[PDB]
Amino acid sequence: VGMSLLALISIFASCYMLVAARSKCLTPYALTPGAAVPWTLGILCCAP
Amino acid sequence: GKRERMCMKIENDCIFEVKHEGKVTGYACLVGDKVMKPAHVKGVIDNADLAKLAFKKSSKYDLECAQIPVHMRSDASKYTHEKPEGHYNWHHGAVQYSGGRFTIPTGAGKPGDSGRPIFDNKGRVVAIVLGGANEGSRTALSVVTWNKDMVTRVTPEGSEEW
Amino acid sequence: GKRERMCMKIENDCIFEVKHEGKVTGYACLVGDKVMKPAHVKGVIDNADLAKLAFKKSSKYDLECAQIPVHMRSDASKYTHEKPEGHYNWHHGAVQYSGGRFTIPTGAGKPGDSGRPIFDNKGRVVAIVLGGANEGSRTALSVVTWNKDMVTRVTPEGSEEW
Numbered sequence: 001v002g003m004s005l006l007a008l009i010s011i012f013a014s015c016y017m018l019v020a021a022r023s024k025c026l027t028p029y030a031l032t033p034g035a036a037v038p039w040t041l042g043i044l045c046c047a048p
Numbered sequence: 049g050k051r052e053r054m055c056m057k058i059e060n061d062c063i064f065e066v067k068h069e070g071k072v073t074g075y076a077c078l079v080g081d082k083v084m085k086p087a088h089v090k091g092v093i094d095n096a097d098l099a100k101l102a103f104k105k106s107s108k109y110d111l112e113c114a115q116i117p118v119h120m121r122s123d124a125s126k127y128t129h130e131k132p133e134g135h136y137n138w139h140h141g142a143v144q145y146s147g148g149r150f151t152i153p154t155g156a157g158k159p160g161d162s163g164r165p166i167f168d169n170k171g172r173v174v175a176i177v178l179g180g181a182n183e184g185s186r187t188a189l190s191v192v193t194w195n196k197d198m199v200t201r202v203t204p205e206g207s208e209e210w
Numbered sequence: 211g212k213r214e215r216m217c218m219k220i221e222n223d224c225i226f227e228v229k230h231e232g233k234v235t236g237y238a239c240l241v242g243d244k245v246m247k248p249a250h251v252k253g254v255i256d257n258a259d260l261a262k263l264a265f266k267k268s269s270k271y272d273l274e275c276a277q278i279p280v281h282m283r284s285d286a287s288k289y290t291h292e293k294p295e296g297h298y299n300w301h302h303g304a305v306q307y308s309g310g311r312f313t314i315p316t317g318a319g320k321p322g323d324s325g326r327p328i329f330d331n332k333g334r335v336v337a338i339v340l341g342g343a344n345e346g347s348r349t350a351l352s353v354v355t356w357n358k359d360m361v362t363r364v365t366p367e368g369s370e371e372w
Binding site: 147181183184185186188204205206 | 242280281282283284285288
């Protein structure tokens with residue numbers, strides 16, 4: 001039970017860190033009025 | 049003379065005040081399908097049609113913005129991404145962009161009107177005010193201004209929120 | 211003319227002399243976010259606020275620069291790096307830049323005026339004086355100048371110290 005809890009904690013922390021990194025990399029484009037996100041960076045970070 | 053009237057006509061229905069408990073505490077500008085406003089000013093805009101939006105806050109730039117409903121997208125400003133040395137317009141007099149800095153005379157410019165934007169000679173929004181750095185007789189401004197691609201914040205040392 | 215009219219007005223509050231046990235020995239210029247003065251003059255800057263700062267000394271360039279207080283940034287001149295052919299303004303007359311040497315007829319400029327900024331017709335500082343050297347009837351200035359990125363010091367052959 002301890003090992004399972006630790007594994008889930010590690011997975012959740014890693015996923016949260018990728019989510020935060022994607023947010024930081026993509027959010028400036030969401031503020032610019034022009035909002036011309038490169039399609040390549042949209043591919044990697046799943047940008048609408 | 050004419051440019052002042054033009055700039056005021058552009059922002060006649062381009063500025064929404066964000067009241068708190070019935071009192072004016074700031075504003076919000078409409079440009080490029082983005083309802084951008086400072087992320088520090090507290091309260092809610094009067095417009096209920098604009099109250100039901102989900103902003104994307106950012107502590108780094110002090111800038112939270114949303115999308116503009118298609119109903120009033122016609123009443124939106126225009127934007128520019130170049131700042132040659134010269135003269136720029138404001139709701140309280142005129143501003144100068146000297147050495148990468150937005151400058152106003154002291155006294156003019158007081159807290160509570162932070163959200164309102166800055167126009168140019170052609171009549172397009174060039175930057176959004178956040179605060180100023182009071183010093184001597186010319187008050188240097190802490191501004192959020194977008195370059196051609198990113199949103200950039202320029203803040204002089206020792207500036208305080210409006 | 212009017213260049214000598216305006217340069218004095220700008221130079222009025224852009225100078226803060228330095229006193230050596232009550233004797234004037236040099237000047238400190240307030241240009242572009244930095245207080246600077248040559249390193250060979252002694253004493254204390256007569257200004258109250260500028261007396262106690264952490265100046266950075268560079269014996270190679272004979273220059274010493276600090277960070278100007280925030281509450282007096284408005285009283286700061288304008289700077290530039292481009293210095294084309296022509297004539298340039300000075301406190302004790304006028305100077306001309308020809309062939310990489312700032313030329314002055316001899317006699318003008320006594321030991322005691324090190325740190326005088328050199329302006330253009332538009333009131334923008336290009337240089338700071340450090341000394342002189344007689345070449346017949348004229349004198350060339352040991353001067354510290356700037357480029358787009360780094361500060362540069364150029365000194366003639368067999369110059370004296372002012």
